[PDB]
Design a protein around this ligand. Structure first.
Ligand SMILES: O[C@@H]1[C@@H](O)[C@@H](O)CO[C@H]1O
Ligand SMILES: O[C@@H]1[C@@H](O)[C@@H](O)CO[C@H]1O
Lengths: 214, 223
């Protein structure tokens, strides 16, 4: 059995989940009031710790489910945050994970039962520790992702107008966009495709495809 | 004692140092100096210590195992599969860089028994090191697409062929010369100087430089 590596120290390994939600033209962040010390009661990302019996990726899934009830949310790793004094309680290196989801009814009731709250990304309260830095990094990742592949397949209807698409991009990027230049930029995205169908007024309908994955 | 209902983990460090030299990319490798898997081909592997940030751990590990200092690395990810390290549960945070080989002390590296291996002729690496390398390589490609790159990998006055060679090595593919120079035209961070190449491979070729102001990374990503 003994002890490979026992000369080295061990560390608490944190998990923080960053859940962006799109609804009615706005992005919100899912937040809670932290249920343990230090900084108990203060505004927080969904925070937990990696356990011995699980991968770090599965820790994220578990932490999310424990603190919000949400299951079946695919998340992408944001990074390992390991500044010495990031957590005032102990040395904690935290691994952040993020997703962008479409905010829907059953999920809404579930989240509310956990005392998690959707807060508009332009009106965030002061978050504990380095959570604002984590959120900023996830938001930049989301921006970059949206420029190279479909940002999600159930954020918008299967067939969507350019106006609907523009509202999603403006929310992600956090600034209004020029309609003509946005249309030109979309024409350069081979993963968005104009169909023959029209909205029912007369606006052209577009769809995401799988061309960014080839 | 906060958080004591939770366990603690060994936190690995792995450094993935790609080197650019004579139009090709290499990986800096070593023979692992501790067990298990002692003597086998490995990345610069260590562990985070109590004294240091994880970023600073990656610096110390790099300097201990190669002598290289002042090398900026970007985080690849935390690799946390339960069985990735057969010795023990270790969550390893991999870091990467693409450096200019000639710009560093090649004898200092040699002294540390670290070897540049060509990126297309890698030996079998230990544990999940090939996965880490693959991930770093994909990030290098993604950056090269969306950002200005290679200020310290090219001479201050460089040709379009030299710039092309960098991109070709990064993506690992020959490129169309026609379309590349068209893409180079849309890059506002590369400016054409008055000067010309009197020593290199295409004599009299236009020498370009990076415009520092335009090279600078945007604080927020632009569509
Ligand atoms: O980021 C914190 C981490 O440092 C630990 O306190 C667990 O909760 C997370 O939200
Ligand atoms: O990836 C390994 C890590 O798991 C630990 O063994 C330290 O060295 C690294 O190379």
């Amino acid at each position: 059995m003994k002890n490979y590596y026992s000369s080295n120290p061990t560390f608490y390994l944190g998990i923080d989940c960053i859940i962006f939600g799109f609804n009615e033209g706005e992005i919100s962040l899912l937040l809670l009031k932290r249920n343990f010390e230090p900084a108990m009661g203060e505004w927080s990302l969904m925070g937990g710790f990696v356990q011995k019996d699980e991968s770090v990726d599965d820790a994220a899934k578990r932490v999310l489910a424990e603190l919000t009830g949400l299951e079946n949310v695919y998340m992408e790793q944001v990074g390992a945050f390991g500044a010495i004094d990031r957590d005032p309680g102990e040395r904690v290196v935290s691994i952040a994970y993020y997703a962008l989801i479409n905010i829907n009814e059953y999920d809404r009731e579930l989240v509310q039962k956990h005392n998690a709250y959707w807060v508009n990304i332009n009106e965030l309260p002061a978050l504990i520790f380095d959570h604002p830095e984590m959120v900023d990094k996830a938001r930049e990742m989301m921006k970059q992702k949206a420029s190279v592949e479909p940002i999600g397949f159930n954020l918008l209807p299967k067939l969507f107008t350019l106006s609907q698409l523009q509202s999603l991009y403006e929310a992600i990027y956090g600034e209004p966009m020029d309609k003509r230049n946005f249309r030109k930029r979309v024409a350069e995205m081979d993963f968005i495709e104009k169909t023959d169908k029209i909205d029912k007024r007369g606006a052209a309908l577009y769809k995401f495809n799988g061309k960014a994955y080839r």
